[PDB]
Chains A and B, each alone.
Chain A
């Protein structure tokens, strides 16, 4: 009963996450490249303590 009272909300979550994932799934290597580039960029300004 608790799940059924939130059934509309849960399936709205499902239908929204479906679009989110279907739009963000093809770029997995792009995301790995982005994280590596971000680490490289933020390492450029932290080679010393100050």
Chain B
């Protein structure tokens, strides 16, 4: 039971600290997908980069 109590309170503290930066956290997935698409497009559209 003591472990359960400490687990719950520390989970609350950790989640509060994490979602304090909610504006960036909410956009994390969208930004990572966008940068993935941009890197893929940049590599795809410049196939002569290696020759240069």
Contacts of B46 in A (CB 8 A): none
Nearest Cβ in chain B — how far from A26, in angstroms?
8
Interface Cβ pair total, 8 Å cutoff:
50
Name the residue among B4, B5, B22, B29 with the largest chain A CB count within 10 angstroms: B5
Does A38 count as interface, using CB distance less than 8 angstroms? yes
Contacting pair A37 B15 (CB below 8 A): yes
Specify the main secondary structure of chain A where it touches its partner: helix
Q: Looking at chain A, what size class is its interface with the partner chain?
A: 10 to 19
Q: Which residue of B lies closest to A43 (CB)?
A: B26
Contacting pair A34 B15 (CB below 8 A): yes
A interface list, Cβ under 8 A from B = 19-20, 22-24, 27, 30-31, 33-34, 37-38, 40-41, 43-45, 47
